[PDB]
Amino acid sequence: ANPSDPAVQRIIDVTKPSRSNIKTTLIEDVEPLMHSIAAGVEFIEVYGSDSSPFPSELLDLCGRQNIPVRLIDSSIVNQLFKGERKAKTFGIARVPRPARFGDIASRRGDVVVLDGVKIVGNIGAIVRTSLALGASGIILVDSDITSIADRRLQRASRGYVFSLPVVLSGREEAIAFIRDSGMQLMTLKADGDISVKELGDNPDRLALLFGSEKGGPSDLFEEASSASVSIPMMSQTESLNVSVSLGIALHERIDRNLAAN
């Protein structure tokens, strides 16, 4: 373990602050770490607080992946971070190459397609929900996001932005991929023809499309769109937050996305 200051550990104090270096980034907490490693994300070294029980399985995973792991005493860990108290566990990872359609095609499970969603808070929460409910990947269209390593997005996603393919794509390219991949594009809308409760019956791999406005997504998607899906509300004149709408849709598909895996 290291209790002194620094040693060469200074790297941690470099990749964390509002520095510049992009090649590396910090991923906090055990679960984001576990899922990152599982997704092939390369790590330089994983750390942990000597005042916290280092998760047995992370230690093991890192072991079977040749990932070095060192303990750090409380005082130094407290110096870092704050005031979210503690990460208690974290690692230095090389920022992966941009995700591609190929990363989604080779995986199994529904695909989440966002169109016009720009608020990082929504995108972040959507990343978490998609991962937790068994989505294969996410395709972002018109999100104003240039890179997925955007720290705002990393933080908004609880550090899960690398745990599943998040592809930045143009509208036409996304449509072409979905079309030629054999997936069934489903447009979720408050005034959709089909009840969201009927999604569980669908045996096909689905591409669930969401917008940012109650009129979204772009009507230009209607061409590729196979059907419109609606989430029942008190009245269909209301609407739900896109992240909330995503959660319900994926919730209805949970069995199909578990069967896929």
Ligand X SMILES: C[S@@+](CC[C@H](N)C(=O)[O-])C[C@H]1O[C@@H](n2cnc3c(N)ncnc32)[C@H](O)[C@@H]1O
Burial status of residue 107 (CB atoms within 10 A of its CB: 0-12, 13-18, 19 or more): middle
Name residue, tokens 């899922």.
Answer: 35
Part of the chain binding a second copy (CB under 8 A), chosen from 2-10, 15-23, 170-178, 238-246 = 238-246
Give whole-number Cα distances, 76 to 72, 89, 178, in Å: 7, 13, 48
Q: In what order do the strands lie in the sheet with 24-28?
A: 24-28, 89-94, 43-49, 69-72
How far is C-alpha 247 from the chain's CA centre?
13
Considering only the C-alpha atoms of the chain, give the largest distance between any 2 of them, rounded to a whole number of Å. Answer: 64
Tell me if 211 is assigned to a ligand binding site.
Answer: yes
Instruction: Quickly count helices (H) and strands (E) in the chain.
Output: 10, 11
Q: How far is the CB of 249 from ligand X (least distance, A)?
A: 7
Part of the chain binding a second copy (CB under 8 A), chosen from 11-19, 93-101, 175-183, 249-257 = 249-257
Tell me if 158 is assigned to a ligand binding site.
Answer: yes
Total residues at the site for ligand X (CB under 6 A)?
Answer: 21
Part of the chain binding ligand X (CB under 6 A), chosen from 3-11, 72-80, 145-153, 213-221 = 213-221
Question: Can you tell me which of 43, 47, 90, 210 binds ligand X, judged by CB under 6 A?
Answer: 210
Binding status of residue 213 toward ligand X by CB under 6 A:
yes
Binding status of residue 157 toward ligand X by CB under 6 A:
no
What is the rounded CA–CA span in Å between residue 142 and residue 112?
Answer: 14
Binding status of residue 247 toward a second copy by CB under 8 A:
yes
Considering the complex, state which of residue 144 and residue 213 has its C-beta at the smaller distance from ligand X. Answer: 213
How far is C-alpha 76 from the chain's CA centre?
30
Considering the complex, state which of residue 154 and residue 245 has its C-beta at the smaller distance from a second copy. Answer: 245
Considering the complex, state which of residue 31 and residue 73 has its C-beta at the smaller distance from ligand X. Answer: 31
Q: Which segments of 42-97 does DSSP mark as H helices, in order?
A: 58-64, 74-79
Positions that interact with a second copy (CB under 8 A): 31, 121, 125, 128-129, 131-134, 231-234, 237-241, 243-248, 251, 254, 257-258, 261
Positions that interact with ligand X (CB under 6 A): 31, 188-190, 192, 210-214, 216-217, 229-231, 233, 239-242, 245
